[PDB]
Design a protein around this ligand. Structure first.
Ligand SMILES: [Zn+2]
Length: 336
């Protein structure tokens, strides 16, 4: 049958992936898959801080000196990527006919009901902001679950941590609107000036270098994660980044330890523009032992609107995880 990993150059990843139905899905394996990607601003990108300590600008140190560049912080990357997976899940849902819908209701939603989950309407939906605690975006990117989500969690707080960890994504050039009139206030303090980066306008064409580590994923979870990234376009919501981007996956590598970081890659490419960066990066990734990814092939090999395509296996994988999670909670709570 169909083998999307083989269609992409990605067959050698298999030994490193988890299998749906594995009794030990909750137990971690001591390896990771690095994914390196590019984010390019189509129009202007607007960056906004969200609370004390959040940043839009950061320093790249490199051979010729130091430059402060725009940066997309990890929790913004999380927010937009998970919001995209969620939208793809909604479109999958809306692609179902009566036959495939009953599959979802009976084989997925029903199974979730049996497992104690409360958000089990036959009309499926989840948010990014309640959450069901069993859908692919919840299980992959994480959630804080309580008795509100699952009737078996009385007196318990159950945390799912993300299995997709983002580096910050770093711009290679300081291409921002010169702006002196941002203003922030709190009580009797106010702040303005050129160096206030509460809001940043990143110029069209700016490229950011990104990296993520993907751990303990199954095949469809991995592919759907790559695909959610690759299909990012309109960014918004409440995540502090707003505008249109194009994202390209450049390469993956499995290993016990990471071979690179977004920061180092960007620093290597300080001052350089899109085409030069992409060229340099492709070479660097090859030297680092990365398997190239054909972003165009990725987009075509996955049809999230096919009722029996990858997103079916994604849902199977998610409910599998959720089952193992519930079992783990019951087996480790120590009675009661
Ligand atoms: Zn969910």
């Amino acid at each position: 049958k169909r083998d999307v990993l083989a269609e992409l150059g990605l067959g050698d990843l298999r030994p490193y992936l988890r299998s749906i139905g594995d009794k030990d899905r909750i137990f971690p394996k001591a390896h990771r898959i690095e994914v390196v990607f590019l984010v390019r601003a189509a129009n202007y990108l607007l960056l906004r801080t969200e609370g004390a300590g959040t940043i839009n600008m950061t320093t790249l140190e490199y051979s010729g000196g130091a430059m402060e560049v725009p940066v997309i912080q990890p929790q913004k990357l999380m927010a937009v990527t998970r919001r995209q997976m969620l939208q793809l899940l909604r479109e999958y849902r809306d692609s179902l006919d009566e036959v495939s819908k009953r599959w979802l209701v009976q084989e997925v939603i029903g199974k979730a009901k049996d497992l104690g989950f409360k958000k089990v309407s036959e009309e499926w939906n989840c948010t990014i902001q309640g959450m069901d605690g069993f859908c692919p975006h919840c299980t992959i990117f994480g959630a804080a679950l309580t008795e509100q989500h699952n009737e078996k969690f009385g007196g318990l707080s159950i945390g799912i941590k993300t299995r997709v960890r983002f580096d910050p994504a770093f711009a290679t050039q300081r291409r921002i609107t010169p702006e002196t009139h941002n203003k922030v206030t709190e009580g009797h303090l106010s702040m303005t000036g050129q160096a206030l980066f509460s809001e940043v306008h990143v110029e069209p064409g700016t490229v950011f270098i990104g990296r993520a580590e993907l751990v303990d994923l199954t095949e469809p979870e991995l592919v759907a994660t790559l695909y959610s990234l690759a299909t990012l376009r309109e960014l918004g919501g409440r995540s502090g980044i707003y505008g249109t981007v194009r994202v390209e996956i450049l390469g993956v590598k499995a290993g016990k330890y990471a071979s690179t970081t977004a920061y180092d890659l960007a620093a290597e490419n300080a001052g350089k523009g899109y085409e030069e960066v992409k060229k340099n990066l492709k070479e660097r990734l090859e030297k680092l032992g990365f398997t190239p990814v054909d972003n165009s092939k990725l987009l075509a090999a996955v049809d999230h609107k096919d009722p029996n395509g990858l997103f079916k296996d994604l849902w199977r994988s998610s409910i599998d995880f959720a089952e193992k999670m519930v079992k783990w909670v019951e087996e480790l709570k120590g009675g009661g």
